[PDB]
C-alpha cells in the first residue's frame, strides 16, 4: 500500500456514511485517511477486534460482505471499502 492512497478523496455511499456518522462529523467528501481512521475507531469502540475482526454481528458485516476479516490483509480491506464509496 503506497502512502499516497491516504490522500484519495471519496464520497461514501449511504451505508458507509451511516457507519461513519456514529464516530465522526458528517460531511460529503472524506479522505481515505479519515475513512480508515473512523472505521478503525468504530471497530475498537464496539470491540469487534480482539488478528481477526468479527462483524457478522454488526452493520460492518453488511458493509464489507464478510462475517470476519484479518486486520493485516490491507489490500482486501481497501477493496471492501471501495465498493462502498465513490472516488472524486
Ligand atoms: C482495527 C484497529 C485499527 C487501529 O488503527 N487498525 C489496525 O489495528 C491495523 C494495524 C495494522 O495492521 O497496521 O490496521 C489498521 C489499518 C490502517 C490503514 C489501512 C488499513 Cl487497511 C488498516 C487499522 C484499521 C483501520 C480500518 C480498518 Cl477497516 C481495519 C483496520
Amino acid at each position: 500500500i503506497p502512502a499516497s492512497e491516504q490522500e484519495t478523496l471519496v464520497r461514501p455511499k449511504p451505508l458507509l456514511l451511516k457507519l461513519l456518522k456514529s464516530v465522526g462529523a458528517q460531511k460529503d467528501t472524506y479522505t481515505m485517511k479519515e475513512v480508515l481512521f473512523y472505521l478503525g475507531q468504530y471497530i475498537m469502540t464496539k470491540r469487534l477486534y480482539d488478528h481477526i475482526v468479527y462483524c457478522s454481528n454488526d452493520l460492518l458485516g453488511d458493509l464489507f460482505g464478510v462475517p470476519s476479516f484479518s486486520v493485516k490483509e490491507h489490500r482486501k480491506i481497501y477493496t471492501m471499502i471501495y465498493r462502498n464509496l465513490v472516488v472524486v
Side-chain angles (χ1 to χ4, degrees), residues 1-20 22-88:
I1 318 297
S4 70
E5 167 61 359
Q6 314 276 116
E7 282 144 69
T8 304
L9 301 161
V10 305
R11 287 187 167 144
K13 298 177 189 188
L15 286 310
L16 177 53
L17 195 54
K18 177 192 179 74
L19 199 149
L20 303 167
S22 70
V23 295
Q26 201 256 39
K27 48 183 188 160
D28 282 11
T29 299
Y30 293 85
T31 57
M32 273 308 293
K33 167 172 150 77
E34 285 163 332
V35 178
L36 275 302
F37 167 79
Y38 290 130
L39 287 165
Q41 284 300 317
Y42 180 87
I43 287 162
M44 292 317 295
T45 189
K46 294 204 82 181
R47 307 191 208 207
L48 304 174
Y49 178 62
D50 103 319
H51 292 272
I52 312 306
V53 175
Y54 294 91
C55 53
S56 77
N57 199 20
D58 195 274
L59 164 73
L60 183 66
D62 299 309
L63 258 210
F64 276 11
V66 289
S68 71
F69 62 96
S70 177
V71 294
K72 284 203 159 186
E73 22 190 44
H74 291 188
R75 212 94 65 177
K76 289 168 197 177
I77 288 160
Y78 276 107
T79 299
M80 289 183 291
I81 293 162
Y82 262 56
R83 298 207 264 256
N84 287 109
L85 55 76
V86 171
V87 178
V88 302

